[PDB]
């Protein structure tokens, strides 16, 4: 073929319930427009996205695009697309594959959408059980992907939990417990900080534990 298609240099990340856009490229910088542009995920069809002869063939696209994507094509003259998804959720995470053909050529890339949802304000439960001893459970609703539990100290020493879970909801986005005990007399704050690692983001919450 007498021109390639480029993927982007790195994953797109695209929270849960936003737009996300998959872009694709060719090399060198030739106008795509009149291509087919086929934007799919494990089978070749039906395709997530699929332009022909300019216009969207919705009839070859999964049920489950339809009506939720769209090229983007401000700069398709420079051969230079991509395919917005709308309301982005946890089962659009994954490897993308975009195709590019015009008569016997065609060229391929890969674009790897990331979602991302960020939860709940953490809670911490304190239940004071079998004689000093105090258990700590920390609750939050809503992550996308497996979130991360950091238990801190006040002056800063991260500590394990003792126990962990995290079950997805129906649109699959996690509910983390996690549960701690604290053997001292010493401490006087705890923390729990719910960190998504993909975003960079947490939240945290402070609790107090009496003598």
């Keep these: 073929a007498p021109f390639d298609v480029i993927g982007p240099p790195e994953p797109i990340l695209a929270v849960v319930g936003e737009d996300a856009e998959l872009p694709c490229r060719l090399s060198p910088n030739v106008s ?23 216009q969207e063939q919705e009839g070859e696209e999964m049920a489950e695009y339809r009506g939720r994507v769209s090229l983007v094509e401000d700069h398709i003259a420079e051969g230079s697309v991509a395919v917005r998804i709308q309301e982005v959720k946890a089962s659009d995470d994954g490897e993308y594959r975009c195709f590019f053909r015009q008569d016997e050529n065609y060229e391929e890339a890969i674009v790897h959408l990331k979602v991302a949802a960020l939860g709940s304000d953490p809670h911490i439960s304190m239940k004071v059980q079998e004689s000093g001893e105090i258990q700590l459970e920390c609750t939050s609703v809503g992550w996308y992907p497996e979130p991360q539990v950091q238990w801190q100290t006040h002056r800063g020493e991260e500590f394990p939990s003792m126990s ?45 534990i009496p003598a």
Aim: glycine share 6%; hydrophobic share 40%.
């Design 32 to 54: 795509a427009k009149g291509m087919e542009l086929r934007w799919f995920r494990e089978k070749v069809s039906p395709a997530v996205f699929l332009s022909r002869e300019g």
């Design 164 to 208: 962990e879970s995290r079950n997805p909801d129906e649109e699959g986005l996690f509910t983390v417990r996690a549960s701690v005990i604290i053997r001292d007399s010493s401490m006087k704050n705890v923390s729990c900080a719910i960190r998504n690692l993909l975003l960079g983001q947490e939240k945290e919450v402070e609790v107090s």
